[PDB]
Amino acid sequence: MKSVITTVVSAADAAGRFPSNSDLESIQGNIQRSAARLEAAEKLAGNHEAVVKEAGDACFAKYAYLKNPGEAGENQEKINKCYRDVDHYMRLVNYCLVVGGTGPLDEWGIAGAREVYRTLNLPTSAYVASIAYTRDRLCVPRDMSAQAGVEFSAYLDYLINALS
Amino acid sequence: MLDAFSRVVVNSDAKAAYVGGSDLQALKSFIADGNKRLDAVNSIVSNASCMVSDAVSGMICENPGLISPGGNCYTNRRMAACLRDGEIILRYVSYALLAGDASVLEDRCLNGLKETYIALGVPTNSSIRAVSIMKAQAVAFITNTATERKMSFAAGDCTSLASEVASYFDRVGAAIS
Amino acid sequence: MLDAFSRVVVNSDAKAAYVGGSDLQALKSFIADGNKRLDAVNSIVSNASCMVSDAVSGMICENPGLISPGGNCYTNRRMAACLRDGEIILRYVSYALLAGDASVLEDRCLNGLKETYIALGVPTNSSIRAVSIMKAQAVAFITNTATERKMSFAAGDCTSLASEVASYFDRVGAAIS
Amino acid sequence: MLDAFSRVVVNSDAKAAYVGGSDLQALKSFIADGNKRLDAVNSIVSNASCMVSDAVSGMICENPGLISPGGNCYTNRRMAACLRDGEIILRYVSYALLAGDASVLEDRCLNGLKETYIALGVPTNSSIRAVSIMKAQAVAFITNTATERKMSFAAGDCTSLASEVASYFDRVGAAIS
Amino acid sequence: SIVTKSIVNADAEARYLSPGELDRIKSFVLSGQRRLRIAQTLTENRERIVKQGGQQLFQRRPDVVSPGGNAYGEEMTATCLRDLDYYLRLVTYGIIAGDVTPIEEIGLVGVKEMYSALGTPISGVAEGIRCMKDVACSLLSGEDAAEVGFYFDYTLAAMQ
Amino acid sequence: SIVTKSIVNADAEARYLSPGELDRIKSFVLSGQRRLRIAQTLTENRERIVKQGGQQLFQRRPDVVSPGGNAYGEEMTATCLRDLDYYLRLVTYGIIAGDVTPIEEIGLVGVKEMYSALGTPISGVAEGIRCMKDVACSLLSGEDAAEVGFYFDYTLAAMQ
Amino acid sequence: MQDAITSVINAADVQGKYLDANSVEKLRGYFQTGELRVRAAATIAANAATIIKEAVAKSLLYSDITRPGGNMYTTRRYAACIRDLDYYLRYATYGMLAGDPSILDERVLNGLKETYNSLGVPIGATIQAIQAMKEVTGSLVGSDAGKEMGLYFDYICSGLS
Amino acid sequence: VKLLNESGVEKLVEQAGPYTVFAPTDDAFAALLEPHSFNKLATLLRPENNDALRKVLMHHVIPGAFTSASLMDRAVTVKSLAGE
Amino acid sequence: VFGLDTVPYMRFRGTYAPNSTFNLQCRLQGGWARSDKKLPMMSMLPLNNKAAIMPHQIVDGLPVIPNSEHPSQKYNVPKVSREKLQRELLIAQGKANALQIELDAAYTSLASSRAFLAPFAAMAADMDIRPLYGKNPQVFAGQFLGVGAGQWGKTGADTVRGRSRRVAADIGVKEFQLERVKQLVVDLQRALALEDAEADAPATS
Ligand SMILES: C=CC1=C(C)[C@@H](Cc2[nH]c(/C=C3N=C(/C=C4\NC(=O)[C@H](C)[C@H]4CC)C(C)=C\3CCC(=O)O)c(CCC(=O)O)c2C)NC1=O
Ligand SMILES: C=CC1=C(C)[C@@H](Cc2[nH]c(/C=C3N=C(/C=C4\NC(=O)[C@H](C)[C@H]4CC)C(C)=C\3CCC(=O)O)c(CCC(=O)O)c2C)NC1=O
Ligand SMILES: C=CC1=C(C)[C@@H](Cc2[nH]c(/C=C3N=C(/C=C4\NC(=O)[C@H](C)[C@H]4CC)C(C)=C\3CCC(=O)O)c(CCC(=O)O)c2C)NC1=O
Ligand SMILES: C=CC1=C(C)[C@@H](Cc2[nH]c(/C=C3N=C(/C=C4\NC(=O)[C@H](C)[C@H]4CC)C(C)=C\3CCC(=O)O)c(CCC(=O)O)c2C)NC1=O
Ligand SMILES: C=CC1=C(C)[C@@H](Cc2[nH]c(/C=C3N=C(/C=C4\NC(=O)[C@H](C)[C@H]4CC)C(C)=C\3CCC(=O)O)c(CCC(=O)O)c2C)NC1=O
Ligand SMILES: C=CC1=C(C)[C@@H](Cc2[nH]c(/C=C3N=C(/C=C4\NC(=O)[C@H](C)[C@H]4CC)C(C)=C\3CCC(=O)O)c(CCC(=O)O)c2C)NC1=O
Ligand SMILES: C=CC1=C(C)[C@@H](Cc2[nH]c(/C=C3N=C(/C=C4\NC(=O)[C@H](C)[C@H]4CC)C(C)=C\3CCC(=O)O)c(CCC(=O)O)c2C)NC1=O
Ligand SMILES: C=CC1=C(C)[C@@H](Cc2[nH]c(/C=C3N=C(/C=C4\NC(=O)[C@H](C)[C@H]4CC)C(C)=C\3CCC(=O)O)c(CCC(=O)O)c2C)NC1=O
Ligand SMILES: C=CC1=C(C)[C@@H](Cc2[nH]c(/C=C3N=C(/C=C4\NC(=O)[C@H](C)[C@H]4CC)C(C)=C\3CCC(=O)O)c(CCC(=O)O)c2C)NC1=O
Ligand SMILES: C=CC1=C(C)[C@@H](Cc2[nH]c(/C=C3N=C(/C=C4\NC(=O)[C@H](C)[C@H]4CC)C(C)=C\3CCC(=O)O)c(CCC(=O)O)c2C)NC1=O
Ligand SMILES: CCC1=C(C)/C(=C/C2=NC(=C\c3[nH]c(/C=C4\NC(=O)[C@H](C)[C@H]4CC)c(C)c3CCC(=O)O)/C(CCC(=O)O)=C2C)NC1=O
Ligand SMILES: CCC1=C(C)/C(=C/C2=NC(=C\c3[nH]c(/C=C4\NC(=O)[C@H](C)[C@H]4CC)c(C)c3CCC(=O)O)/C(CCC(=O)O)=C2C)NC1=O
């Protein structure tokens, strides 16, 4: 769970020293950003029915071959579990925009990701098609502020780079 | 480990929900008082030295039986181990105060220290008191009620942080008891 | 570890005697349908990757609480550990089938697994349902009664090898119960 | 007897299923070592008839005055009724062992028995001698130190169980006193 | 049962069975043998009847098995075929009883309430029953098929 | 109407209106002005309400307009939108009356019989009414939308 | 039947007392929650059929009681039990609006266990269906109204057990 | 009564149907501690064996109302709720 | 593994091969605050399968995780005397047994529900079902392209209905209360062995 405080406390812990001015300095960086990266968590928390519906069918629009017989979404519960997965991923992005780190993305969606999908034959292109669609559906002055728009997109492109 | 921001996330993940505004405030009060917290911890780290010497010598000043032929802090090797342990406990309490959460002070300080002190023969009555004191010094340094040294600050109330570190210290005391 | 040839030697060494012709016919029968055994094991190595997916997804298809938030196979890290463990168990059952003896299955795999899962909080019921689905797949692949895929072979009976692997799978089930 | 253990498992009870059940108390007694209690009460019910016979013959070959004319064990009815009484006391103390609790031993046989034997003129000390003989036979059957009789058990110690019936037989012998 | 219904209808009036009711009971016990034969034929051809009725239903009503329909998926289709088997069994009961009392007391009283509470369209069940009726009457003679469809028609009327 | 219902409920008991009933009539005549305003807003935005409700219905229930569905074709779709307009008009009547008497006496008593005789799925009508409810409540204030959806909810409950 | 107001007035009248400060306390308490109660009652009236359908689906829809031999096998019995569940939901809504379970005692629980015992209706399955209905109802009406409704649901289950 | 309640047979005997119950007294259950009947019913104490306790209990319930005067000098064979 | 440049460390690697060495591994290195000054001999008896290694001794050697849905009651257990802790173990053991011996009955009910619909599914296999829409992009499926308006559900398995899926949830709810009470006996054993090791020091016990 790499946040900004977990980074400095464990770094001080290695040498068994007392939190010095380096370690105190990093926490005020989680004061100036964190007044406005939590408004993105407001935008994600109240809009999450619509942003995972709008991104859930974007991958099926790009990849219509999945809905055939004996594929990722062969039947209806395949699509239900796919929308479940897009909801899970946007929840971890909402966590990362809150904590101030990529911890909850890493150890809950990114660690062991490739393995599962590979064995479960879940195309990675379908998963990145939704997050990439959500990244460019956002325009800055309508949905959030300027500080929120960059930090919300930065957690999305981090997961895009991690998934493929 | 966790901090104050992570514990609401862990608590809300076991309820399958996003970070709404219903519990986002308490964090704004926690983030709004960030400067006060940083004023609080610096008061303990700056007097971390004198705190262990005032604590461990006071332990013997109230118990002259832990230094006699057959007492744990008796010899020169054991005194260094006890003065080391006191400062380790103070270091983890300062970690928990800076974090706002007590996640690091439960699985990396008190976890597995009960049987460790039982296999060595470290008195439990002398340990509790030792840690209990460090608490009286910390609540005096937080509120700037220290009789020997005063520091410079902006004026106001700090009993919330004094209470948080007071709850951390007897949390240390309850685990080794 | 042992195999089918070594277990009669271990059993006869605790009796202090040579290997005569009296019991020199069960091993010759192990030899004569030994080519059936090599025909038997290859059908499991051919479908080993589909067997774990059909097993572990069927486990959730009969129990949706494992993926409820908090469940054992809930997050992405835990799903990989469970899909890894299923294939480890299948690998050791294939070792025991090729060996003709369950010695390699006991010590390297099942020795200490039950309270390992107890300490980790792994639910035993779902684990038993996971090994039993793989048992049902293995006895269908041995006898070529698989509805989705058929293989090429020489004709005849293979219920002896199907029963050996069926006895290995609930031997796995009894140890973790 | 039959209701000594809870046996909660029920299907479509409409009172039991989806309703509170003795889970906290009944289950713990059963888990904790009920196999030893079951071998115990089996070692009583397979030996009961020889126990009361040997007990009353030991009482008679100690005190012949009951078999003399004018004695309480003279007459056709007395021998039959005294055998019946001793066996009833044995059955109740066997239940009290099986329950791990001496309440029904009070409520169904020991409640008002002494005044009954006074009203019938039954001598008390001979019956005390009888129940002490049954106590010795019971602890002999429970240590598997019967010089004449053998059952095979799973290996282990039943010392805690043995005291139980000594406390119960002393409860009977004090309540008749 | 015809005997039961005659007995109750005579019981309410506080009279013995008139010679007409006894005549009809006699005619019923005389035809019981071909009733059992027809019940035999319908009973032991149940698999083909349910299968071919399910086909005609799913071709006539593709919405119920379309994506999201009430019988959408493997389990729901199996449950619908289970219901069709239920009604075929009830029809055999009614054939041997000589009257729709078994069919109506089991499976018709309150059927609309049940299927409305389950979210199932009752017209789909009626279509399935009609398809099963055609399939089953195909395997009987002229007079036998006429007498057997006599009960399918009642089940359809009650299930409007 | 609230006045009418109070008068009948007092008439059956052979008594004048108690001060509670008169209090409630007074409160009703005092709120009549905002009742008329809300009826205005709902009344004169009927085209958008019916159109957007028809969309949400047809996207939620594609079977009714699928090939062969009850509202399949130009004429049938027009008739379904006509029905939705009927129910919006009844909701405006109920809003001005202060009670669901107009809605229930016209369009709710015997609605299941009518729609069963026509072959129309009543659940589709309920879906259309719910979609119209969301569309119409989107155009009102908080308290106004709460009071207006109060009648859509009753119409949905009666149309189960 | 008596609601919270009727109960307070009765407690005051049975002593020849005027409504003192404690009665005012209880009356204010009821008046503050009345609007939430009306909201919950409206929402429950909106979705009664779906609540009953979902509770039956989660509680006893695929169990053995719906199969031959079970206590709700035929269509008559299925319809009768769903009507019973509708009764329970409607009367729980009445009790929640009134803030007093006396209507449940007078109109529902009086002689219900005896009727079910004479008919052979399983009580445990009924209590479990009511518990499942409590879940869905609290779900639909939110936390506070769900606790209010669950009070009377548990009242019915205790009176039935 | 305790066994009827925890076994689930209470629902059967609470029905309105005319039953003749042959309930054994507490003396009867205490008299199972002899060897023969113990060997047959000891495993009914284990908490997983409710299915056989149910049949043993159901064997005591007879459909129909047989009074004692009804049975004088008569030999009747019936089926109890256990099906035996 | 370590090469020429890494300080050695406790290797946690998901194969661990022989399972037994993993329980040995967490027993040998337990806790962050335990040291090796004054500890008894540990591993001759578990290496020859004689002393079963304790389950809580693995928990004290494992690195701790954030998702702790059965949180360790090592610190919420109160300081109560040894005999009442013995009693509270036995109630929890009995209740862990009673929740097990009905969970197998739920498994039998699932296996019976599949026998209820065995030939119906065989009939349903070979019969052609062609859906109305939703499988090809030329037709108008509406909101059944994928599912509509937040009705994917918390899991995909809760949306789908059926006889077997309904007893699946029954298995999944008696599940979580079995592993609730089974994670209670581990820390109770950790308290009991704790007080026995307290008695083994030179003291009044
Ligand atoms: C907390 C973090 C978290 C995640 C990141 C996801 C990741 C994830 N997805 C799946 C699992 C799945 N993901 C899909 C989705 C798809 N497959 C298809 O058939 C479609 C093509 C495609 C839609 C995009 C399906 C169908 C499963 C179930 C596996 C299967 O049925 O084969 C599973 C297995 C458990 C399950 O069924 O949910 C996990 C852990 N889930 C999580 O809990
Ligand atoms: C929290 C995450 C979050 C998002 C990423 C967006 C995603 C998003 N966009 C739209 C919907 C829209 N979004 C825009 C915005 C834009 N289109 C453009 O061409 C411009 C470049 C850009 C900013 C002016 C427009 C014009 C629509 C309506 C048309 C459409 O659906 O694209 C909607 C439907 C309702 C709405 O408008 O909000 C949603 C959920 N909203 C969110 O709540
Ligand atoms: C021989 C007998 C002997 C003693 C009884 C103790 C004396 C002593 N002093 C303090 C108490 C304290 N000790 C300190 C420590 C310090 N004060 C400063 O300002 C410095 C920075 C730093 C040491 C250099 C502080 C801050 C307090 C709190 C009260 C105070 O402000 O003085 C306490 C804790 C009170 C309690 O138990 O609750 C004790 C027991 N020391 C001894 O040697
Ligand atoms: C690493 C360097 C660094 C720090 C140490 C802190 C330093 C610091 N503390 C305060 C500011 C303050 N600090 C305190 C704290 C206290 N006042 C008292 O009377 C008690 C002695 C003590 C309680 C613990 C209070 C009460 C304020 C003003 C109110 C507030 O900031 O919320 C301020 C003014 C800015 C503000 O108003 O927030 C600054 C810069 N911040 C930093 O960037
Ligand atoms: C040589 C033999 C051998 C094995 C058998 C495995 C046994 C094993 N499994 C796990 C570890 C695990 N095992 C599971 C598995 C499951 N949870 C369930 O309910 C299902 C029944 C099952 C999946 C099918 C999970 C989920 C974890 C990780 C626990 C967690 O992080 O939450 C661990 C701890 C190491 C780790 O975290 O990866 C070990 C040693 N490993 C071995 O080396
Ligand atoms: C969502 C719900 C869901 C399920 C209920 C299961 C479905 C399922 N399939 C099998 C059963 C099986 N699964 C396989 C596996 C395979 N078959 C092949 O030929 C391939 C090579 C390979 C996977 C690609 C085999 C061989 C069987 C045995 C029956 C058969 O031959 O199909 C079993 C075991 C039967 C038992 O429990 O005893 C189950 C439960 N999967 C699910 O997802
Ligand atoms: C690594 C490569 C390699 C193999 C895989 C096996 C391949 C193999 N299997 C068989 C031969 C056979 N294999 C089978 C086995 C089966 N037949 C069935 O109907 C079942 C599907 C299955 C049961 C498990 C039987 C019954 C025979 C013929 C009888 C026999 O060989 O004893 C033969 C013919 C030689 C012989 O008669 O022994 C060969 C070459 N041998 C090899 O060298
Ligand atoms: C002169 C009259 C006279 C007798 C009739 C016997 C009666 C008798 N038996 C035992 C003692 C015993 N009696 C039994 C009972 C039995 N042993 C078996 O193997 C059978 C199964 C069962 C019926 C025979 C047992 C097991 C003991 C203890 C072992 C022993 O002493 O033989 C005792 C000693 C009890 C005590 O006080 O400690 C006496 C007095 N002895 C006598 O002195
Ligand atoms: C529930 C528990 C329970 C019991 C224990 C017995 C107790 C008991 N015993 C007797 C009755 C008797 N009990 C004895 C017994 C003895 N006399 C002796 O000298 C010996 C000490 C001893 C046998 C070893 C005799 C001899 C009688 C008959 C006395 C008589 O003839 O009147 C009676 C009077 C009724 C009768 O005469 O039968 C009762 C209530 N009954 C019970 O219901
Ligand atoms: C329903 C009938 C029924 C029984 C009779 C018992 C029979 C029984 N006893 C034990 C098992 C045992 N039984 C005993 C008891 C004893 N061992 C001795 O040497 C002493 C003489 C005696 C003390 C009273 C012991 C010590 C064990 C092994 C530990 C235990 O399981 O309690 C076991 C489990 C292991 C095994 O199968 O052997 C069983 C089934 N259990 C039952 O379910
Ligand atoms: C003996 C008289 C009798 C009948 C008829 C009966 C019906 C009955 N049908 C059921 C379900 C069902 N029935 C269907 C049926 C259909 N779906 C369609 O689209 C078609 C129109 C129709 C098939 C022709 C479906 C899909 C379910 C499952 C519904 C669900 O679980 O969501 C259920 C609940 C689960 C179960 O089967 O136990 C019952 C009790 N019970 C009875 O005692
Ligand atoms: C004021 C109260 C009131 C109502 C509601 C009413 C309804 C009504 N709806 C009708 C038809 C119809 N109604 C529909 C409606 C629908 N099709 C669907 O699939 C949907 C579920 C639904 C639209 C939401 C259709 C398709 C018809 C024509 C049926 C036919 O002619 O076959 C007809 C016959 C023709 C006509 O409109 O005159 C009447 C009388 N009459 C009334 O007096």
Residue B110 pairs in a beta bridge with none
What's the gap in Å between B60 CA and the centre of ligand 3?
A: 13
Residue type at D11 in one-letter notation: N
Nearest CA to E120 out of G81, G90, C64, G75 is that of G75
| E110: alpha, beta or left? (left if phi > 0; alpha if psi -120 to 50) | left
Closest by CA position to G42, among listed F25, F2, F156: F156
How long, in residues, is chain D?
177
Helical H runs in chain B?
Answer: 4-13, 24-32, 34-45, 48-62, 76-99, 104-107, 114-120, 124-142, 159-176
DSSP collapsed to 3 states, chain C: CCCHHHHHHHHHHCCCCCCCCCCCCHHHHHHHCHHHHHHHHHHHHCCHHHHHHHHHHHHHHHCHHHCCCCCCCCCHHHHHHHHHHHHHHHHHHHHHHHHCCCHHHHHHHHCCCHHHHHHHCCCHHHHHHHHHHHHHHHHHHHCCCCCCCCCCCCCCCCHHHHHHHHHHHHHHHHHHC
**Whole-number Cα distances in Å, C72 to C94, F75, I102, I182:** 26, 56, 21, 14
User: DSSP assignment, residue B23?
Assistant: T
Element of type H or E holding E127:
helix E122-137
What torsion do the CA atoms of F33, F34, F35, F38 make, to the nearest 10 degrees?
A: 130
G71 is in an annotated binding site: yes
SS3 D117: helix
Centre of ligand 1 from the C-alpha of residue G140, in Å:
28
HSE (side-chain half, CA atoms, 13 Å) at I87: 7
> CB-based burial of residue F134 (10 Å sphere; 0-12 exposed, 13-18 middle, 19+ buried)?
middle
Reference E71, options E24, E119, E114, E135; nearest CA is E119
How many domains does chain A fold into?
Answer: 1
**Which element (helix H / strand E) includes H61?**
strand H61-63
Please state, as a whole number, how many other Cβ atoms lie within 10 Å of the Cβ of residue H71: 11
Q: Residue A28 C-alpha to ligand 4 middle, in angstroms?
A: 12
Q: Are B63 and B138 in contact (CB under 8 A)?
A: no
Of C149, F78, H29, nearest in space to D1 by CA: H29
Instruction: Domain ranges for chain B, please list them.
Output: 1-177
What atom of ligand 8 comes closest to residue D133's alpha carbon?
Answer: 35
Q: What is the dihedral of CA I56, I59, I61, I67, to 10 degrees?
A: -170
Residues 87-116 of chain I whose Cβ lies under 8 A from any Cβ of chain E: 116
The number of the ligand 2 atom at minimal distance from the alpha carbon of A144 is 1
d(CA A121, CA A117): 6
In order of E114, F2, F160, the CA distances from F125 in angstroms are 21, 27, 9
Ligand nearest the Cα atom of residue D34: 10
Is residue F9 annotated as involved in ligand binding?
A: no
Q: Which two tokens stand for residue A136?
A: 């460019």
Q: Alpha-carbon dihedral of residues F105, F106, F108, F113, nearest 10 degrees? A: 110
Give CA–CA dist D55/D134, Å, rounded.
Answer: 6
**Nearest-CA residue for atom 18 of ligand 12:** F71
For A50, the token pair is 């619509």
Tokens of D77: 């009815």
Contacts of H26 (CB under 8 A, 6+ apart): D108
**Any chain D CB within 8 A of the CB of G131?**
yes
Return the SS3 of F73. coil
Neighbours of chain I (3+ CB pairs under 8 A): A, B, C, D, E, F, G, H
**In the block, residue with structure tokens 């003795």:** D22
Which residues partner with H21 through β-bridges? H61
| Rounded Cα gap, residues F15 and G3, in angstroms | 25
Q: Experimentally, how was this structure solved?
A: cryo-EM
Contact D3, D26 (CB under 8 A): no
Q: How many contacts, defined by CB atoms under 8 Å, are there between D and G?
A: 29
Question: Which residues are within 8 A (CB) of G133 and not within 5 positions of it... i.e. 6 or more apart?
Answer: G51, G52, G55, G59, G85, G88, G89, G153
**Measured CA angle at F108 (ends F107, F111), to 5 deg:** 85
Chain F's closest residue to E113, CA to CA, is F160
Calpha distance E19→E97 (Å, rounded): 21
- In this complex, whether F and C touch, counting 3 or more CB pairs under 8 angstroms, is no
- Range list of H helices, chain D: 26-31, 34-45, 48-60, 76-99, 103-104, 114-119, 124-142, 159-175
Q: What amino acid is encoded at A57 in this protein?
A: D
Q: How far is CA D96 from its chain centroid?
A: 7
DSSP letter at D32? Answer: T
CB–CB of G106/G153 below 8 Å? no
Distance between CA atoms of F155 and F157, rounded to whole angstroms? Answer: 6
Mutation site for G-interface testing, chosen from I114, I160, I163 by largest number of G Cβ within 10 Å? I163
- C-alpha F81/C-alpha F87 separation (Å) is 10
Q: What angle do CA B101, B103, B108 make, to 5 degrees?
A: 135
Distance in angstroms (rounded) separating the CA atoms of residues D93 and D134: 10
- G13 touches I: beta carbon within 8 Å: no
Atom number of ligand 3 nearest to Cα B129: 37
- Residue of minimum CA distance from atom 34 in ligand 11: G61
**Single-letter residue type at F9:** N
Q: According to DSSP H, which parts of chain G are helical?
A: 4-13, 21-46, 48-59, 75-98, 102-107, 112-119, 123-141, 143-160
Residue D142: closest CA among D49, D52, D36: D36
Q: How far apart are CA A127 and CA A136, in angstroms?
A: 15
**Crossing angle between the packed helical segments C34-45 and C48-62, to the nearest 10 degrees:** 60
H/E element holding A29?
helix A21-32
Q: Do F59 and I133 touch (CB under 8 A)?
A: no
CATH superfamily of the D1-177 domain: Phycocyanins (1.10.490.20)
Dist. CA F15–CA A155, nearest whole Å = 72
Whether the Cβ atoms of residue D141 and residue D47 lie closer than 8 Å to each other: yes
Nearest CA in chain D to G117: D14
Say how many CA atoms lie within 13 Å of D97 toward its Cβ: 33
Q: What lines the ligand 3 site, CB under 6 Å?
A: B 47, 50-51, 54, 57-58, 61-62, 133, 136-137, 140-141, 146-149
Which one of B45, B129, B137 would you pick to mutate in the ligand 3 pocket, going by the greatest count of ligand atoms within 8 A of its CB?
Answer: B137
* Domain carrying residue A80: 1-164
Residue nearest to atom 2 of ligand 6 (CA): C61
d(CA E83, CA E77): 10
Q: Around Cβ E129, how many Cβ atoms within 10 Å?
A: 21
Which residues have a Cβ under 8 Å from the Cβ of F139 and sit 6 or more positions away?
A: F41, F45
Which of G62, G135, G136 should be substituted to probe chain I, the one whose Cβ sees the most I Cβ atoms within 10 Å? Answer: G62
State residue E76 phi and psi, 5-degree precision: -70, -40
Could you tell me if G89 and G149 are in contact, meaning their C-beta atoms sit under 8 angstroms apart? no
Distance CA I168, CA C67 (A): 13
F112 contacts in chain G (CB < 8 Å): none
Residue E76 structure tokens: 């729901």
Burial I52-73 (b: 16+ CB within 10 A, else e): ebbbbbbbbbeeeebbebeebe
Distances (CA, A) of A103 to A94, A116, D131, E71: 12, 20, 74, 44
Spatial neighbors of I77 by CB under 8 A, at least 6 apart, are: I187, I188, I191
Which residues of D fall within a CB distance of 8 Å from I97? Answer: 27, 30-31
User: For helices B48-62 and B76-99, what crossing angle results, to 10°?
Assistant: 130
CA distance I147 to chain E (A): 9
Asked if H16 is an interface residue toward chain G (Cβ–Cβ < 8 A), one would say yes
Listed resolution, Å: 3.0
Kindly list the protein residues whose Cβ atom lies closer than 6 A to any atom of ligand 4: A 24, 28; B 33, 35-36, 38-40, 42, 142, 144, 153-156, 158, 161
Cβ distance H61 to H21 under 8 Å? yes
Tokens, residue H50:
């409710």
